[PDB]
């Protein structure tokens, strides 16, 4: 597993000058401040407990917090549902925001970047449209 601080530092390298990122978090999953402080990227967490909360909570990340990307950390329950994943990817993409995701299943559906212990995995077509260049050293 790639830890959250390792993930956020990788996001910082892919999106230099990102200032605010939104996390959609499954309230019922098992188990960011040091990550946020170590990177200087504000992390806004919107928690969801069921599918019907995903749309309202996502739209609050955008309306109230002006986030520049979506970050999903795990998929053990609600965020493992196809409907939640498809909603988040489609609406983040419509809003012009890349999605940093926990597995490659997300990338096949249009998320931008995931990771594995650390190697990066990139949906090249999405990263290019989003203006994301993978560092040469990676």
Numbering used by the authors: 27 to 57, 65 to 150, 155 to 175
Show passages lifted from the paper.
Substrate-binding proteins (SBPs) are key structural elements of the ABC transporter system that determine the substrate specificity and high affinity of the ABC uptake system. A typical SBP consists of two α/β domains, which are connected by a hinge region. To understand their molecular functions, we performed a crystallographic study of single domain SBP from Rhodothermus marinus (RmSBP). The overall structure of RmSBP showed the single α/β fold, which is identical with that previous reported, although the molecular flexibility was distinct.
The crystal of RmSBP soaked with NaBr (RmSBP-Br) belongs to the orthorhombic P212121 space group with unit cell parameters a = 92.84, b = 97.86, and c = 101.98 Å, containing one RmSBP molecule per asymmetric unit. These three disordered regions were shown to have relative flexibility in the previous crystal structure analysis, but were clearly disordered in RmSBP-Br. This indicates that these regions of RmSBP are likely to be dynamic in a tentatively solution state. However, the position of three disordered regions of RmSBP was not directly related to the previously predicted substrate-binding site of RmSBP.
